[PDB]
Each structure stands twice: as C-alpha cells, then as structure tokens.
Write a protein that holds these residues in place. Structure first.
Motif, mmCIF file in Angstrom:
data_model
loop_
_atom_site.group_PDB
_atom_site.id
_atom_site.type_symbol
_atom_site.label_atom_id
_atom_site.label_comp_id
_atom_site.label_asym_id
_atom_site.label_seq_id
_atom_site.Cartn_x
_atom_site.Cartn_y
_atom_site.Cartn_z
ATOM 1 N N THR A 103 0.798 -1.230 0.000
ATOM 2 C CA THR A 103 0.000 0.000 0.000
ATOM 3 C C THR A 103 0.825 1.273 0.000
ATOM 4 N N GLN A 104 2.125 1.144 0.235
ATOM 5 C CA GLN A 104 3.034 2.288 0.181
ATOM 6 C C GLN A 104 3.873 2.318 -1.102
ATOM 7 N N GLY A 105 3.543 1.465 -2.073
ATOM 8 C CA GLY A 105 4.263 1.427 -3.334
ATOM 9 C C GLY A 105 5.527 0.581 -3.382
ATOM 10 N N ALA A 106 5.836 -0.138 -2.307
ATOM 11 C CA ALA A 106 7.022 -0.967 -2.275
ATOM 12 C C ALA A 106 6.799 -2.235 -3.102
ATOM 13 N N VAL A 107 7.801 -2.558 -3.898
ATOM 14 C CA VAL A 107 7.764 -3.679 -4.798
ATOM 15 C C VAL A 107 8.628 -4.876 -4.345
ATOM 16 N N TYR A 108 7.983 -6.037 -4.262
ATOM 17 C CA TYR A 108 8.566 -7.279 -3.782
ATOM 18 C C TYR A 108 8.648 -8.278 -4.930
ATOM 19 N N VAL A 109 9.762 -8.962 -5.054
ATOM 20 C CA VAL A 109 10.003 -9.907 -6.158
ATOM 21 C C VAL A 109 10.503 -11.227 -5.635
ATOM 22 N N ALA A 110 9.826 -12.310 -5.998
ATOM 23 C CA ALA A 110 10.400 -13.656 -5.822
ATOM 24 C C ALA A 110 11.483 -13.949 -6.868
ATOM 25 N N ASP A 111 12.722 -13.926 -6.415
ATOM 26 C CA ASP A 111 13.885 -13.974 -7.265
ATOM 27 C C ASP A 111 14.375 -15.415 -7.264
ATOM 28 N N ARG A 112 13.785 -16.212 -8.138
ATOM 29 C CA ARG A 112 13.789 -17.673 -8.019
ATOM 30 C C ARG A 112 15.185 -18.245 -8.180
ATOM 31 N N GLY A 113 15.943 -17.655 -9.094
ATOM 32 C CA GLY A 113 17.314 -18.078 -9.333
ATOM 33 C C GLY A 113 18.259 -17.802 -8.178
ATOM 34 N N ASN A 114 17.910 -16.893 -7.290
ATOM 35 C CA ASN A 114 18.776 -16.572 -6.162
ATOM 36 C C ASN A 114 18.129 -17.017 -4.864
ATOM 37 N N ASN A 115 17.035 -17.773 -4.971
ATOM 38 C CA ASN A 115 16.376 -18.318 -3.785
ATOM 39 C C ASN A 115 16.193 -17.262 -2.710
ATOM 40 N N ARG A 116 15.684 -16.093 -3.100
ATOM 41 C CA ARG A 116 15.409 -14.970 -2.198
ATOM 42 C C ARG A 116 14.217 -14.135 -2.680
ATOM 43 N N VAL A 117 13.742 -13.286 -1.780
ATOM 44 C CA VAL A 117 12.784 -12.246 -2.065
ATOM 45 C C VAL A 117 13.434 -10.901 -1.836
ATOM 46 N N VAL A 118 13.356 -10.032 -2.837
ATOM 47 C CA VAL A 118 13.911 -8.695 -2.765
ATOM 48 C C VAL A 118 12.859 -7.613 -2.718
ATOM 49 N N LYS A 119 13.168 -6.535 -2.019
ATOM 50 C CA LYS A 119 12.230 -5.426 -1.852
ATOM 51 C C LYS A 119 12.812 -4.120 -2.310
ATOM 52 N N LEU A 120 12.016 -3.355 -3.014
ATOM 53 C CA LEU A 120 12.400 -2.009 -3.380
ATOM 54 C C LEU A 120 11.320 -1.027 -2.916
ATOM 55 N N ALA A 121 11.683 -0.146 -1.984
ATOM 56 C CA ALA A 121 10.778 0.878 -1.462
ATOM 57 C C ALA A 121 10.525 1.890 -2.567
#
Length: 254
Positions: A103-121
């Motif tokens: 709700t604040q515009g932050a973007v979350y990505v399931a980064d499958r090749g790196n077995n992580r989730v990344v966030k960009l505010a």
C-alpha cells in the motif's frame, strides 16, 4: 461453478503466467513467450509494454500502475494510460517470477534463481533482501495490509510468512501443499496458493490451523492467482491458455 474469462481478438496463445485484478475489475495477464505481452480484459487490449521476454508475474496497484517481471531479469512498470514504461532499479535478478506491491508502493520480487525475495521501497534506488531462510526456487510473493510478506517456497513444498512485527519465518499450516507457485492475500488476510503441478488451488483462512481445496475443475498448471474485493478468485490456467474465475459470493436463501 467456475467460468472461463473470454479473452477475445488475440493473435497469440494467451500463455497466462500471471494474473492481477484492479478495482474496476479489469483483469490483467502476462502472456508468456518470446514476444511477451500484458493483456487486459475490461473487450480485450494489449498494454504498450515494449520488449517483454517471457514475462512471469504481474501486479496492479491502486493507481492502476502495472508492474511486470520478465526473463531480461527486470521489473518494468506502466502507469495507467501511459505508453512509456520504466525499469525499476532492481539488481542481480535471476529468473524473477511473482511480484507484489504493498500500500506504500514498495515492490517485492520472488527472485527464483537466487532463492530470495527482494524489496524495493517506492522511489528508492537500492533494494533490500528480505530475511527469509532456506528458500528453494520461490515463485510467488504476496504482501498483506499488515506488511506481512508471504512466499511460495516451491521446491520445499511450503508457504512462508515473514511476520512484520517479529520478522520471524512461520511455515503456514497449509495441509499437504505440493510445489506451490502462485499466491495472493485478500483483504481478510486469507492466503490463496496454486499447487502448480498437482492442478489445485488452496486457501488458508487468517489465523486458522488448516486449509481447504477450492473447487476448481480441469486446471492444467495453475501458475498464478488473484482475488478481488468480492473475494472472487482468478487463476492463470497456463496449460489451457485461459484464466478461470471462481466466485465466493453467497446465494440468497439457498
């Protein structure tokens, strides 16, 4: 009870890898393939993204901005009615799959090749890696109104919630979840997940101890799931080149 959404006037197989639904009930799908497309059912049209390569995941925010992942390893966004996409400054993405926008515009990505989730505010120029642990090919991410983040740990056959308060990882009590991929969270905290090679969609009620199998029929590789304000559930039925829809609304005096 399910219905197939009528995508018409289309010159390519739909190949739906992702599905989102905005406030007006416009449905958006990523159409996988060398020449990737985002298709919007209102009639049907194609959003002016340029150069999408195997797009894997999408989300639409309250302003109508569409956010897409693809196998150029980036996230592209299109503001409503714009014809000029912008590439968000994610770094090091390797086969991004599902994404989510809070709700604040932050973007979350399931980064499958790196077995992580990344966030960009929103408006930030550097990403954060969320403190998940033990992920093996995460394919799907969702964020609720309470900043809880939910991931499909596909090859671990589980769904993990990083709680906003404790920052602890809880393996949500899904019942016998297999190779979960698509995920969405509705406004009541209820979590929907596709089990993509077993062709079901399951749900878990918020704070509940076990899950149920939504009554879809004929699914073939369900890879994404969305849910609107009516709590209607939409599924990217990838092997059938279609989106199927299942309403939850109650029937008067039946």
């Amino acid at each position: 009870g399910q219905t197939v959404l009528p995508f018409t006037g289309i010159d390519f197989r739909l190949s739906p890898s992702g599905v989102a639904v905005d406030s007006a009930g416009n449905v958006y799908v990523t159409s996988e393939g060398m020449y990737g497309r985002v298709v919007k059912l209102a009639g049907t049209t194609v959003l002016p993204f340029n150069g999408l390569y195997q797009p894997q995941g999408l989300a639409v925010d309250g302003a109508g901005t569409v956010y897409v992942t693809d196998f150029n390893n980036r996230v592209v966004t299109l503001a409503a009615g714009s014809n000029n996409q912008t590439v968000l400054p994610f770094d090091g993405l390797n086969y991004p799959e599902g994404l989510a926008v809070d709700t604040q515009g932050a973007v979350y990505v399931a980064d499958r090749g790196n077995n992580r989730v990344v966030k960009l505010a929103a408006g930030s120029k550097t990403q954060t890696v969320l403190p998940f642990t033990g992920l093996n090919d995460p394919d799907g991410v969702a964020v609720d109104n309470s900043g809880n983040v939910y991931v499909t740990d596909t090859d671990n056959n589980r769904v993990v919630k990083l709680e906003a308060e404790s920052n602890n990882q809880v393996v949500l009590p899904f019942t016998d979840i297999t190779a979960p991929w698509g995920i969405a969270v509705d406004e009541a905290g209820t979590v929907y997940v596709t089990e993509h090679n077993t062709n079901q969609v399951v749900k878990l009620l918020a704070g509940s101890t076990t899950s149920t199998v939504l009554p879809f029929t004929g699914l073939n590789t369900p890879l994404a799931v969305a849910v609107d304000s009516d709590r209607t559930v939409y599924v990217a039925d990838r092997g059938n080149d279609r989106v199927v829809k299942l309403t939850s609304l109650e029937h008067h005096h039946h």
